[PDB]
Design a protein around this ligand. Structure first.
Ligand code: VZ9
Lengths: 237, 300
């Protein structure tokens, strides 16, 4: 069935699973044409497929060329996502294929299920959580490779850097979603928070700064304050 | 004109013959149904006055033998049987007519309802769906499950309808995932029509039989099948013009004949709103849509 706050620890067990998020697959800018009408112009996108236990991220870059000459692109995007997830699975050695895939939007269930008919033992599930994965394009190095891409391209990351050396995947996932929730609600403040102290750098092989244990606790508090704040600034409370 | 005589009516029962039904009292002198129109399949069906649970009944064709009804007090139901001694059978039937103990299947000079409900239903096909080959008539009841239902338990007493599954490899060609799932023409036209049914008439015949089982016995899985066969057509962008026209006719009479009070269990809101208002064929069922909107606007 669905994934919600009650069966939350299943994400960290030893059953391989992947979240798929398709919110950034089809992206556009809206602009006015000379004649004064509105037109869309598409920009590169990506599929966010993440192992919540290992932190492995299979970032598939959706080059704008894949929309050329197509109609009903919002709907094709969901079918293109499923086609690419299925290809990823088929590329993995059996003992590495996921036992469940969790789609962050219900509109992806039917497209993925159809593409995965060859994998009847892989459970396609929805979730009742409001996970902030759409803010993944606020992470500079992920944004950078998508926008630079000139062809379809898969790029592999560990979204937890080296955290797992020192904390559990449960804690690691909680930090990530707090960071992504903060970036989603007020990106400038979230980014200011992360980068104030110039002495804390981001390693070339990492996505986030090399905070100590103590520095992460302060950081995490600042992101909570931000998220509580913007909620007031928004509802007036 | 043919006859289905009854040995007797020892228990109180509502009897139905095609779309008509009457009441027979415990041990009333009743000996059967006469003036039955040759040339169509028929259904005689039973609901006991004591136990409205279990509607049951027999599909049959009077051309395929001399059939009679006899109550069995061990099994506790009206059983259909065949008399091979045709002389004995004509003799018996003539005596009950002379004594006028048989009700008359209504001869109705203007009504084609039953023909329109059974146009493509044929007894030979029924007996592939309801396997019991030692008899020429076919038993059905409220509770019998379909073969696709037993996949999701007794195979002998099942309704072996054609399995339809929109999320199946059968239905979806590799490489055409999105195309074959949004436009099911491939599945209708090549898999089902060319592959399994061979022609539109076998297709419609199964659709009609499924609807009647649902309507007369409330057989849930027949209702599921009826609605599935409808949905596949309605979700195919390419359908022979002549299938669409006959489908509109078929459904129209199905909708017209449905008991008004039963429309809430036998009509699937989603399938019909999809078929009449969203699907490729939304513009193609003019009689069906007019009757549906004038009789059950609530469901839409
Ligand atoms: O408009 C005509 C209505 N009539 C009256 C109601 N019916 C009673 C009946 C008689 C014999 C049967 F085999 C089944 C039912 C016959 C149709």
């Amino acid at each position: 069935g669905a994934m919600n706050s009650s069966n939350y620890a299943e994400l960290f067990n030893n059953d391989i699973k992947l979240f798929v998020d398709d919110t950034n697959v089809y992206r556009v800018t809206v602009h006015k044409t000379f004649e004064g009408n509105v037109a869309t112009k598409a920009i590169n996108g990506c599929i966010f497929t993440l192992n919540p236990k290992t932190g492995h991220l299979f970032l598939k870059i959706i080059h704008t060329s894949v929309w050329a000459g197509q109609k009903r692109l919002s709907q094709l995007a969901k079918w293109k996502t499923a086609e690419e997830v299925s290809a990823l699975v088929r590329s993995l050695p059996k003992e590495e294929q996921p036992k469940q895939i969790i789609v962050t939007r219900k509109a992806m269930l039917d497209p993925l299920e159809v593409h995965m008919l060859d994998f009847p033992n892989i459970a396609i599930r929805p979730t009742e959580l409001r996970l902030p994965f759409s803010a993944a394009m606020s992470i500079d190095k992920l944004s950078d490779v998508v926008m630079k891409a000139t062809e379809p391209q898969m790029v592999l990351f560990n979204i937890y850097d080296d955290w797992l050396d020192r904390i559990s995947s449960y804690t690691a996932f909680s930090r990530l979603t707090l960071l992504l929730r903060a970036l989603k609600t007020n990106e400038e403040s979230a980014k200011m928070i992360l980068l104030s102290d110039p002495t804390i750098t981001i390693k070339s092989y990492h996505l986030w700064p090399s905070f100590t244990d103590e520095q992460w606790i302060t950081i995490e508090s600042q992101m909570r304050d931000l998220i509580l704040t913007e909620y007031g600034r928004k509802y007036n409370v | 004109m043919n006859t289905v005589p009854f040995t007797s009516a020892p228990i109180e029962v509502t009897i139905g013959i095609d779309q008509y039904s009457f009441n027979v009292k415990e041990n009333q002198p009743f000996h059967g149904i006469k003036d039955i129109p040759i040339g169509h399949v028929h259904v005689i069906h039973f609901q006991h006055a004591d136990n409205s649970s279990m509607r049951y009944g027999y599909w049959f064709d009077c051309r395929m033998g001399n059939f009679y009804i006899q109550y069995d007090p061990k099994d506790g139901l009206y059983k259909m049987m065949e008399e091979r001694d045709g002389a004995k059978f004509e003799n018996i039937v003539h005596n009950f007519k002379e004594r006028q103990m048989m009700v008359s299947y209504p001869k109705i000079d203007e009504d084609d309802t039953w023909y329109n409900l059974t146009e493509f239903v044929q007894m030979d096909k029924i007996r592939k769906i309801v396997r019991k080959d030692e008899n020429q008539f076919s038993y059905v009841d409220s509770s019998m499950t379909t073969v696709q239902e037993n996949e999701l338990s007794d195979p002998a007493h099942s309704l072996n309808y054609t399995v339809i599954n929109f999320k199946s490899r059968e239905a979806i060609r590799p490489g055409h995932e999105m195309e074959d799932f949004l436009d099911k023409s491939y599945y209708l036209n090549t898999v089902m029509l060319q592959g399994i049914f061979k022609n539109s008439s076998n297709y419609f015949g199964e659709l009609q039989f499924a609807f009647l089982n649902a309507m007369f016995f409330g057989n849930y899985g027949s209702s599921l099948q009826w609605h599935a066969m409808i949905e596949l057509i309605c979700s195919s962008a390419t359908v022979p013009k002549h299938m669409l026209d006959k489908l509109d006719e078929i459904l129209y009479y199905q909708i017209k004949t449905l008991p008004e009070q039963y429309s809430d269990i036998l009509l699937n809101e989603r399938v019909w709103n999809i078929c009449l208002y969203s699907s490729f064929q939304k513009n193609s069922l003019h009689n069906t849509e007019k009757i549906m909107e004038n009789k059950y606007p609530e469901l839409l």
